[PDB]
Amino acid sequence: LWTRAQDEVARLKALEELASGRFGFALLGYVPVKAKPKVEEALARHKESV
Amino acid sequence: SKLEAILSQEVEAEIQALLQEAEAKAEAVKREAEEKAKALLQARERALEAQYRAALRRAESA
């Protein structure tokens, strides 16, 4: 329960760092090049891979 | 593109529900607006009919 709660709370705190687009939203950051395939594998789960 | 089209289609589904609530609102006005018009016409011809029957009984008693 504490793990799921800390995870959801971190998701909520991360939701504070978003960048909305008026009923739509954007987000940006940095990540290494070595996980760019894992980044794309995560990117496939977006709805049409937005 | 297609991605913006799917997003504006979700918003168009909201807009279509918005037109549907507005359209059923206009219908719920005007169904009974038409029916109060006919209720007026009914009660008007019935009041005139009452006056007609009084006219005929009065003229024949005269």
DSSP codes of every residue in chain A: -HHHHHHHHHHHHHHTT-EE-SSSEE------GGGHHHHHHHHTTSTT--
Size of interface A-B (CB pairs under 8 A): 7
CATH topology of domain B1-62: 1.20.5
Alpha carbon distances (Å) from A9 to A20, A29, B4 = 20, 20, 31
Instruction: Please give the sequence-ordered ranges of beta strands (E in DSSP) within chain A, or none if there are none.
Output: 19-20, 25-26
Residue B2 touches partner A, C-beta closer than 8 Å: yes
Q: Does B3 contact A50 at a Cβ distance shorter than 8 Å?
A: yes
How many residues are listed for chain B in this entry? 62
Q: Which of A20, A23, A43, A46 to mutate to test the interface with B (most CBs of B within 10 A)?
A: A23
Cα angle B1-A21-A46, degrees, rounded to a multiple of 5: 55
Residue B3 touches partner A, C-beta closer than 8 Å: yes
Tokens of B11: 């918003």
Q: What is the resolution of this structure in A?
A: 3.6
